[PDB]
Amino acid sequence: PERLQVYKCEVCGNIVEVLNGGIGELVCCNQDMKLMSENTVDAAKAKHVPVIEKIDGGYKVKVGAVAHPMEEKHYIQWIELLADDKCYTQFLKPGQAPEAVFLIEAAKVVAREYCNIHGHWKAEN
Amino acid sequence: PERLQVYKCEVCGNIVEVLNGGIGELVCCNQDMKLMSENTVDAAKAKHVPVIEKIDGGYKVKVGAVAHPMEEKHYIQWIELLADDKCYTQFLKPGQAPEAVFLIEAAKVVAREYCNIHGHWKAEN
Ligand SMILES: [Ca+2]
Ligand SMILES: [Ca+2]
Ligand SMILES: [Cl-]
Ligand SMILES: [Cl-]
Ligand SMILES: [Cl-]
Ligand SMILES: [Cl-]
Ligand SMILES: [Fe+2]
Ligand SMILES: [Fe+2]
Ligand SMILES: [Fe+2]
Ligand SMILES: [Fe+2]
Numbered sequence A, B: 001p002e003r004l005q006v007y008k009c010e011v012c013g014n015i016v017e018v019l020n021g022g023i024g025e026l027v028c029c030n031q032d033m034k035l036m037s038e039n040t041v042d043a044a045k046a047k048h049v050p051v052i053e054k055i056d057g058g059y060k061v062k063v064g065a066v067a068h069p070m071e072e073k074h075y076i077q078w079i080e081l082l083a084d085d086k087c088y089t090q091f092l093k094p095g096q097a098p099e100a101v102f103l104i105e106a107a108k109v110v111a112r113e114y115c116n117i118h119g120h121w122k123a124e125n
Helices: none
Strands: A006-008 A015-020 A026-028 A050-055 A058-063 A076-083 A086-091 A099-103 A110-115 A119-124 B006-008 B015-020 B026-028 B051-055 B058-062 B076-083 B086-091 B099-102 B110-115 B119-124
Touching: A006 B015, A015 B006, A015 B076, A050 A110, A050 A119, A058 A076, A058 A110, A076 A099, A076 B015, A086 A099, B051 B119, B058 B076, B058 B110, B076 B099, B086 B099
Parallel strands: none
Antiparallel strands: A006 A015, A015 B015, A026 B026, A050 A058, A058 A099, A076 A086, A076 A110, A086 B086, A110 A119, B006 B015, B051 B058, B058 B099, B076 B086, B076 B110, B110 B119
8 A cells, every 4th residue: 555545445434544555455344445546436527526726825625616415425525635745634524515725835736535425536736 | 443543554564544434443464453542652752742832823743842853763754733623644754853834723733643663642732
């Protein structure tokens, strides 16, 4: 595994993010955890690809060009902003807006989001 | 596992952070990953408990009251700031200062750091 990869157990729903990579295969519920590769699921890009906007002091990330649902069983569980050697994670909940604000000094950033149904998505400025 | 717990494989060195919890036990290299519980290792608190300094527009986190080494065989691998539903991670490298700045408008925060040898430490304001 490599730093910042996200892995899911499809049995029990554990989802983890790698902070230090290594060669071992991550396992949960007696099977290999699935690597949630970004932008690989068949789903509406308009609702899943993050849109990155500047704000005073940082960035606002919206999921997506069309606001994604935030329902009990279908919501954006978190949005991340990646820059340099930083990974900023904003967890979200049903009933909230599908967006996040990050205060950061960084000219180049990557935004990620994870949808509990449609998996892992990213964009960059 | 629960959100924001940190688990290490003691065989290959994978370290992961939980983004979504669940009931299965995380496994790597055919053994249960170790839960890296904060402030449990026998290590100098002066060099490991984060120091949280309020600054204009956020917090500066220093590891620790005495600066921790940042050597190839002994360094702080990351510092995090936790506030409500955020987890901001700053990765570090040998040769860098053992500190991080986070722009987080929150009165109450928890700072964490992970040392490659002495494990996982936290403090709160
Ligand atoms: Ca296998
Ligand atoms: Ca993070
Ligand atoms: Cl890596
Ligand atoms: Cl790594
Ligand atoms: Cl959708
Ligand atoms: Cl020490
Ligand atoms: Fe392992
Ligand atoms: Fe979705
Ligand atoms: Fe599992
Ligand atoms: Fe240490």
